[PDB]
Amino acid sequence: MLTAEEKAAVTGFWGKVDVDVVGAQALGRLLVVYPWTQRFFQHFGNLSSAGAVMNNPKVKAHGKRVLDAFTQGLKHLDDLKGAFAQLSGLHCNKLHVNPQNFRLLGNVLALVVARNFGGQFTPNVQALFQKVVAGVANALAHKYH
């Protein structure tokens, strides 16, 4: 949503982004860094260790899809809260996460990519990615019912 000159930039840089372990990691760390989120997943087994939680095939799979899922956001990034509608559904449904943990989680992916990416996750790509989770943190809970 931004310059199309900005959309331009995350569209290109999303894509060099490896989905499988950019959400394993992002799911991964979210895991032992918010230790309380760890609630929503009795869902897999072993988060009572950093080694464990990460690797844990399950919290692995989780991020895979907890991630190009987001990142299928954009295409449209755009219309809507549309998109995401949906998984709102699910999120105030029978989990019931804060709109608060949407925004960590969004903030865990920017530590990810910053350090996978590394000198390119730039205060301007850093910048725009920011928006993006501001956006995707946000539809998911505007969503509430």
Binding site, annotated residues for heme b: 62, 91
x/- mask, ligand HEM, residues 42-61, rule CB under 6 A, reads -x------------------
- Hey, which residues between 81 and 120 contact ligand HEM (CB under 6 A)? 87, 90-91, 95, 97, 101-102, 104-106
- Hey, which residues between 28 and 67 contact another protein (CB under 8 A)? 28-29, 31-39, 50-51, 53-54
CA distance 137 to 33: 18
68 within 8 A of 120, measured Cβ to Cβ: no
Q: Is 58 exposed, middle or buried (0-12, 13-18, 19+ CB in 10 A)?
A: middle
- The sign one gets for the Cα dihedral 114, 134, 137, 10 is negative
31 within 8 A of 53, measured Cβ to Cβ: yes
- Residue from 89, 131, 115 nearest 29 by CA: 115
50 binding a second copy? (CB under 8 A): no
Residues in the site for ligand HEM, rule: CB under 6 A? 37, 40-41, 43, 65-66, 69-70, 87, 90-91, 95, 97, 101-102, 104-106, 136-137, 140
| Contact footprint for another protein (CB under 8 A) | 28-29, 31-39, 50-51, 53-54, 92, 96-98, 100-101, 107, 110-112, 114-119, 121, 123-124, 126-127, 130, 145
